[PDB]
């Protein structure tokens, strides 16, 4: 069962997530994310720090980026 989709503005940036097995976008740019066996998630900008959900991963990315544009 894939997680639900989401869409919101976090720290002035638009983050979106949707089932594909799941895609995340930061200001329209896709963010590589992965699901762990235990159900937690990680993104390419925090690949050793599991967070509970895809939205948590997108928010972690925005946090890490500090305003910087994601590279495709």
């Amino acid at each position: 069962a894939a997680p639900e989709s989401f869409d919101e503005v976090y720290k002035g940036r638009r983050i979106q997530g949707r089932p594909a097995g799941y895609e995340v976008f930061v200001d329209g740019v896709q963010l590589h994310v992965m699901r762990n066996a235990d159900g937690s998630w990680i993104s390419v900008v925090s690949h050793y720090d599991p967070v509970p959900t895809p939205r948590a991963a997108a928010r972690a990315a925005v946090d890490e980026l500090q305003g910087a544009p994601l590279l495709p």
Binding site: H32, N36, A37, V44, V45, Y48, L65, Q66, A68
Partner: protein
């Protein structure tokens, strides 16, 4: 070749190591290591094929990866070897490791930019090319995202685990490999990546030279583990889908198997084990 504790390097050894690293960077060979690691970290998954991470081959894979790097370093200065960072011992931002004559320190609060050392962006010698965002400068936030680095006691508890790995051979597994990797338990290897912060916490972690020192120690811990458990060996040993079995070959090389990398002494030794 002998891999020594970074804390014990002479001023000249630090000089030659830094110079060799900077040359690999200038020549463009360095960035390829960064790319290789990112590509694998992005493809290794718990549900499918996994070679470099969250799998029994995490250890032999990074062992071979580090050997490739050390060999490249030696092609520049034959006297250079990969030092290791014992983060259980040198756990403060004050360790000699983070001095301007070695790796430089933590990044500034505004943007995490490292401002000193030979890899600071301002030197013009360390452009971040292989990246996931627009920032082209080395970034660090020592102890920012995670309070503490593993302690010796915590490391000991992991070294005590007798089983190398256990089914399902992924991030949910029990056993030595996964606890050392950090997905389960007190968390060793993963927490260190998080502690450094910056590029070290991302898929393109090799962008930070400390990446090699961190993994050289994780690699040493595997050697210490084998010493503690001579009756335990690499698993699985045959016919396991998506996972690299003992006698199967590993990507990207294809010409080497975990069985060929179990004994590190065939390639190097440590100042002390």
């Amino acid at each position: 070749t002998v891999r020594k504790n970074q804390a014990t390097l002479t001023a000249d050894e630090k000089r030659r190591f830094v110079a060799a690293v900077l040359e690999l960077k200038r020549s463009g060979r360095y960035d390829e290591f960064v790319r290789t690691h990112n590509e694998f970290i992005m493809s290794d998954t718990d549900s499918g094929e996994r070679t470099g991470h969250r799998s029994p081959s995490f250890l032999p894979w990074h062992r071979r990866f580090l050997l490739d790097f050390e060999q490249a370093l030696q092609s520049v200065d034959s006297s250079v070897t990969l030092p290791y960072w014992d983060w259980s011992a040198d756990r403060t931002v004050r360790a000699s490791l983070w001095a301007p004559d070695f790796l430089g320190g933590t990044g500034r609060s505004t943007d995490g930019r490292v401002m000193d050392g030979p890899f600071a962006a301002s030197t013009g010698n360390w452009p971040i090319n292989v990246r996931v965002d627009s920032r082209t400068y080395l970034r660090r936030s020592l102890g920012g995202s995670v309070a503490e680095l593993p302690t010796r006691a915590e490391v000991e508890s992991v070294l005590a685990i007798s089983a190398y790995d256990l089914p399902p051979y992924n991030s949910a597994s029990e056993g030595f490999r996964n606890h050392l990797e950090g997905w389960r338990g007190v968390n060793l290897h993963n927490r260190v990546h998080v502690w450094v912060g910056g590029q070290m916490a991302t898929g393109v972690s090799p962008n930070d030279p400390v990446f090699w020192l961190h993994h050289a120690y994780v690699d040493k811990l595997w050697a210490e583990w084998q010493r503690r458990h001579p009756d335990s060996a690499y698993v699985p040993t045959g016919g396991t889908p998506d996972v690299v079995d003992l006698n199967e070959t590993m990507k990207p090389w294809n010409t080497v198997r975990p069985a060929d990398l179990l004994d590190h002494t065939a390639y190097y030794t440590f100042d002390a084990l």
